Design a binder for this molecule. Sequence first.
Ligand SMILES: O=C(N/N=C/c1ccc(Cl)cc1Cl)c1ccc(O)c(O)c1
Ligand SMILES: O=C(N/N=C/c1ccc(Cl)cc1Cl)c1ccc(O)c(O)c1
Ligand SMILES: O=C(N/N=C/c1ccc(Cl)cc1Cl)c1ccc(O)c(O)c1
Ligand SMILES: O=C(N/N=C\c1ccc(Cl)cc1Cl)c1ccc(O)c(O)c1
Lengths: 10, 11, 347, 347, 347, 347
Amino acid sequence: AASLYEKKAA
Amino acid sequence: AAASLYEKKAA
Amino acid sequence: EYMNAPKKLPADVAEELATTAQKLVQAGKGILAADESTQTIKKRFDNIKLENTIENRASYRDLLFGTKGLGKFISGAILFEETLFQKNEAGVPMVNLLHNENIIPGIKVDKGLVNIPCTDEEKSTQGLDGLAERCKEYYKAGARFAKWRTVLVIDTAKGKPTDLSIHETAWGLARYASICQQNRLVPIVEPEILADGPHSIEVCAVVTQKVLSCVFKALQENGVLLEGALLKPNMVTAGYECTAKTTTQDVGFLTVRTLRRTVPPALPGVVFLSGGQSEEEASVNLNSINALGPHPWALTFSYGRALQASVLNTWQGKKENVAKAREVLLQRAEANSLATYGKYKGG
Amino acid sequence: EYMNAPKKLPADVAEELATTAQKLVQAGKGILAADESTQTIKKRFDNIKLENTIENRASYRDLLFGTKGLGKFISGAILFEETLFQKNEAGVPMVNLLHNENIIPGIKVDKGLVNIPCTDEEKSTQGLDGLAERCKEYYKAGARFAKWRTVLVIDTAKGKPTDLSIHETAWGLARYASICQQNRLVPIVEPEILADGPHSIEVCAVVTQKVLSCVFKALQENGVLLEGALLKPNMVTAGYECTAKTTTQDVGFLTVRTLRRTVPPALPGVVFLSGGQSEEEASVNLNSINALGPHPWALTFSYGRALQASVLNTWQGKKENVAKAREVLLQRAEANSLATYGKYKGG
Amino acid sequence: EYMNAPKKLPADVAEELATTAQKLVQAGKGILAADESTQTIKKRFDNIKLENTIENRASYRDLLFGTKGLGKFISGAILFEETLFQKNEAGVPMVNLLHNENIIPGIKVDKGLVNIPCTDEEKSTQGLDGLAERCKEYYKAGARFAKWRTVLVIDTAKGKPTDLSIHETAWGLARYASICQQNRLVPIVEPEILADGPHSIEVCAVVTQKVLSCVFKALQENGVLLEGALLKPNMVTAGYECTAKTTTQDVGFLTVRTLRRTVPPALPGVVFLSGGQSEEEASVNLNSINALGPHPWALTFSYGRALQASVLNTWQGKKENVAKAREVLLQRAEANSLATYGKYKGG
Amino acid sequence: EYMNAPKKLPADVAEELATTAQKLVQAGKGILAADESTQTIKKRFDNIKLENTIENRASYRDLLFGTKGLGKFISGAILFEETLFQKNEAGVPMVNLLHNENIIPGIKVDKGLVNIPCTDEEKSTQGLDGLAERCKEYYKAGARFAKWRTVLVIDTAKGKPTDLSIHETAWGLARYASICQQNRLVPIVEPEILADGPHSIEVCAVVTQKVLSCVFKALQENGVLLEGALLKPNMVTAGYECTAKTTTQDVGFLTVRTLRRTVPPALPGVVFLSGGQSEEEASVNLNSINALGPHPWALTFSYGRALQASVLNTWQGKKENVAKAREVLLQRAEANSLATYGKYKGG
Ligand SMILES: O=C(N/N=C/c1ccc(Cl)cc1Cl)c1ccc(O)c(O)c1
Ligand SMILES: O=C(N/N=C/c1ccc(Cl)cc1Cl)c1ccc(O)c(O)c1
Ligand SMILES: O=C(N/N=C/c1ccc(Cl)cc1Cl)c1ccc(O)c(O)c1
Ligand SMILES: O=C(N/N=C\c1ccc(Cl)cc1Cl)c1ccc(O)c(O)c1
């Protein structure tokens, strides 16, 4: 759904 | 310059 | 050393700008605004039915600057770019005529007005591009100060002047001032607020104060040396179409009040523009301002209409009217000179 | 009406504020800052070896305000919340002692300093909550002017004071000022810049100028009436640990220059803080400032350390030394009073 | 290091704020706003003729928080300070009923609204004094996120909201949030613009954009972690007394467009306030907002009126209606949960 | 109407600008920066030992734009003023070469850089004077988007970039963007921060975040439609002389974080500049950025060095190497195209 950044963020 | 006519008719 | 701040000017330059600024606003003397563009001076020549040629423009400027005794009432004369490199019939440069009366040459350095997008025809001033280069050749030609005209409009219904109009005017002025001072030109900051409209004199004071607060803020942010600068504001008056009658006392009080609240004492002087006021009313209002006691800065004038309206009517583009026109000029020159003392009367 | 601009105060309120503010900085008079908090007053009592009790604070404040002839050199007295509602040993209200000498009672309305997040221990001033209600409370108790202390630090290597620190102080001072003016209280704006560090007097001038520019900008945006307010800044001096020594003439010039560049003449007076300066240097420096000719505003003092340091040492909490200490107060009050005229010479 | 910039938060603290911020806006979840003051909750008991006592307030919050299965739709619950330390008639802490349902406790931390001087009754929010101390105590009480309500009014004729109203609101919000993040509390920034007036929905879109642009600018200057923060704005709608008919799609479009122009993707979520909208209007409008494709942030809800209105009438202040009222809460909680998916279609 | 806010753009104009902006950042496509000035393109021809004539400049740009199949990877190409009105050998205008390859013509409208007074050689961009007139000229010539390059320097020791530098940059870009949108041109906002210096990558992130915050702030105050605009910033990288080794994922992480914290989703895309990066590293870093999942905006490229460096070396001003160099252009265009999908392997 969201970007990979958001997934790795928190 | 702290005693002008403007100041004498203000405060 | 505190880095996050505008750096100082070189000592030799700052001292020269400060000296020139003081000289431009010396006691009993004002500035002659004769920097009418080719398109504007055409309007003035049409009222006297005179052809707008280079020959007549030179002849008219020769009439003004060639007037003996003018230097006693005039400390500076603002020129258009054409006039700056212009000569009369005798081949004598116009600048040299100013030097003979010890009148300091000045140059209009802005490129006129353009509309600001996303606003209701609110204006922006052009002239920043290549300004430094022009300042160098203007200084070489004899100019020791410059001017940059900006325009704001009061329309309370449309919220004029808007925030965008104010800050663009303010930042544009500050940008021009720092450039001029870098090239040893004393900048005359002109945030003219038009008197067109039915707004009261109270509204004009509120607007003028808000505008001037934003202008000087922009000046400090750009590192403009206030000691080597001059302010060219409008007189706080009611609108041209305002119903509420206001005498010259109302103009004087609300103008001085506005100036005391926003202009730092470091500013050597403030030159009032005549605007659309008549020659006599411009002198009376200026007199009423200086009648309100001594001021921390010099409150003199930088007139154009109030010094040339009757001169043109007397001249009518005729050689045999030069003498009569030059004496009318001296009359208006001395009239406004007395106004700065607060000692000018009608007759 | 222009609408998008701060409204004006009622004619009655604005007139009273202007009168009080002008009377606070009257010729040859200054303000006694005796508004030390319960915590601050303790470490001053510890130096003279005295318990910080309710009686001792009352007895000491009674000594200051009971001094006959103090009104000759003192126009206003800033009090802490406690002292404002206090009575002496004879059951006589402290505010009445000031009334007898006709010294205007003042009140500290801020609630100390807290750390600004995401900064290096840069301070924010609290006290806005319920400020309007306390101002009404203080006014009925006898207050006619208030104060609000803010602190800035000069650290060139760390970029102090940062932007966040500057406009947080500025907006806080602006908010506090408009609230006090709305409640008939003359606000004393104090953007105190600490003299801690090895920075030169030139750096301080640059920093102070930048701060005052933003301080007054915030005041305008909040519609603070400059005619009914007072500025309490630091003297432009070098840091305590600065190597390049600066004489008092350097302090005087760069202080005046900074004020003339930023402070509008509408502001009636500027009351300098003593800071970490000794009692003698605070008098000498103040004298050097006023020795630079007549100023657009009044340049007097709002001292505490430079008026109470020798008084405490003379008193030492003893009932016997009351009269002896009061003569010390008048001596240091006259010394600073003469400094306002620029006629104080230590020798 | 750049120095002249707001410092970073400690890694551990900023991390907790981020994950908490993520949990509050979980997919299909929102926030229950039960932080009514004891006066605001009074007018709700006046519609069901119930005594405004601590007992009735306890039983009511117990009805809301004691609801099983509520955690599937509710991610967080905003509380008043009273309820945070309050116990039910059975003696079980209110904060524990939330923990059992995996609902994150929240706290309203502002001290109400006060008038801004020189404005036409424009509101300023108080609560900065001792805010850091209260946040530490709230965190130890179970609260993980806070709330700060500000109010702006749209009146085009009076130029509302004015710049002073907008900036004071923005700077106040930024001040509160930086303190909350410092004290491990996720700040909910609420720049609520009232829907009062006859203004069109286009006007609301313009104002909201201007406000949000000023709000988020203040957050950056205060160095507030957007990753660990929430926005609680109003839905872009026309005024109540407006005459220009608009559908829920108009509300949906001009709300999304406004947020896309102003709100950075770093902000994990946006919790809309129900305002004066009815229970059905708030759900349909939220559905229309999410029906416009996937968004960079979570566009969910922080409702109070839209969740508790039908619950109050169903309860009628009776124990036998508790079971019946809690199901009404679930029905409406799920209704808005489906709206976040953009799949809610009542009928 | 709120009045005190930037007025809306005409529906037709705003509609076209939004289309062009999104089309320039179409999936897998990027922008070719071939708008080198005369003195700029000279230093390129000197490296491959080639005389800087008008024939060679025409021949070289003909090689680029005449590349069959370039439209698959290039959405738009930025031209210099000369190139826009130029024709190749065959007689075909350079504009028509772009039209046949589905490439949108772009134009550089800035007049170069000029030092800001009272700063340490911090630059300001000129080109506002007569910009609106040139935009109308460029549009009729075939241009559909414009570019304006501003330069900031990171020097923490000297506090660079200073507030004056940042705000002049921001306001300059702000004015430019509004004028272009007024005249049906999509503005490419380029606040380039130089990677020159030993500063770490963390410092660059903080500075870039601060600059972008001020840039967009200035953008919204002049009322620039973000939907019809593009951003051309530098990648968040460590300094060129920095010692702390940073991987390509460190570049990608701190770049995405910086953009998400500052850039509103209304902006259709962001076109990075290659800067001093090598061709390969410019592709690897762009890939690392896009490898972090689908972003709210299109994060593509506006390269010139990264697309033309190897082309010039292959061509060497000889006709026999044109097709050979055009293939080099295509493989670099495809490399950065795959980088937009995050599907670009090292080799
Ligand atoms: O609270 C005051 N001074 N406390 C200073 C201080 C104490 C201790 C530490 Cl650690 C730091 C600091 Cl800055 C004060 C309050 C009102 C006044 O009029 C005034 O002149 C001073
Ligand atoms: O409703 C609230 N305040 N009262 C508003 C109000 C004013 C005037 C009239 Cl006539 C009616 C009403 Cl309801 C309120 C209180 C706390 C919150 O966190 C919140 O979101 C809302
Ligand atoms: O002309 C450009 N740059 N001038 C570079 C330059 C010139 C002179 C000196 Cl001394 C140093 C330098 Cl770095 C230019 C043109 C188009 C672009 O898209 C762009 O990013 C830059
Ligand atoms: O030639 C000028 N054009 N300025 C605009 C202008 C002129 C005349 C009328 Cl009626 C209106 C307008 Cl907007 C000019 C006029 C006065 C100055 O002080 C100056 O430096 C230039």
